[PDB]
Amino acid sequence: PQITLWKRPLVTIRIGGQLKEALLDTGADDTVIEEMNLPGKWKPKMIGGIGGFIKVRQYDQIPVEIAGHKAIGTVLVGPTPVNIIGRNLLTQIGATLNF
Amino acid sequence: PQITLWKRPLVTIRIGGQLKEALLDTGADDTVIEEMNLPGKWKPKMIGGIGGFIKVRQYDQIPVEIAGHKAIGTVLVGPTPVNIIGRNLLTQIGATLNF
Ligand SMILES: CC(C)CCN(C[C@@H](O)[C@@H]1Cc2ccc(cc2)OCCCC(=O)N[C@@H](CC(N)=O)C(=O)N1)S(=O)(=O)c1ccccc1
Q1: Do B99 and A95 touch (CB under 8 A)?
Q2: Is the CB of B84 under 6 A from ligand 1?
Q3: Residue A79 CA: distances (Å) to CA of A1, A83, B51
């Protein structure tokens, strides 16, 4: 599909058996999901942006479906105000920026 | 052009008569630039990011050339980790997400 940017590019994703709304974010290196109780081992880490840093839990090899497209990779879970799909997973569904 | 996301989508922009590097950020509502001197009046504003809110200077109707494409719009100047081109200007140059 082709998504215009008049509105935030929010799409439905499926992770850990649950459906959620997330932002297709070309400015995010990593994928950051709102606090959820995913099973599996994780490592702590801190990511930063405007406003500072937040602590998150890094989960590897998590399957994620983005608008019907399958992807699998690292997902960071923490107190983010919005679910963010980053470049690490955008590259897997063949997403590009065009202008 | 068509930009893939294996690398950060950084491009050269021209603002205030000077060249800078900035990230095409579909996950950003606004365009935020590292502190610099821009001509014109500005108004204090607060914007939020992943880690919280920061104070920025708001400049309106500023001409910005992004990879040869012109845009004229609001530019926020403040302590951001990286220069970002948000949806407010990306829509002006007709940028879309495709996959
Ligand atoms: C500097 C840049 C390196 C930031 C990379 N990041 C992506 C970026 O798209 C972020 C993502 C985002 C964060 C919060 C949020 C919405 C989206 O809710 C607030 C809505 C207001 C808004 O849109 N805020 C923009 C800035 C602005 N006001 O225009 C913003 O901060 N957007 S990040 O900090 O979230 C990250 C860092 C590390 C790994 C993944 C994501």
Answers
A1: yes
A2: yes
A3: 30, 10, 9
| Dihedral pair phi/psi, residue B28, rounded to 5° | -110, 130
Experimentally, the structure was elucidated by X-ray
What one-letter code names the amino acid at B97?
L
Q: Which residue of A has its CA nearest to B99?
A: A95
Residue B79 Cβ < 6 Å to ligand 1: no
- Contact between chains at B97 and A5 (C-beta distance less than 8 A): yes
Q: Tokens 């989960």 map to which residue?
A: A59
Resolution (A): 1.9
DSSP run (H or E) holding B89: helix B87-90
Question: Which domains does chain A possess?
Answer: 1-99 (2.40.70.10)
Say which residue the tokens 């926020």 belong to.
B76
Buried b (16+ CB within 10 A) or exposed e, A1-39: eebebeeebebebebbeeebebbbbbbbebbbbeeeebe
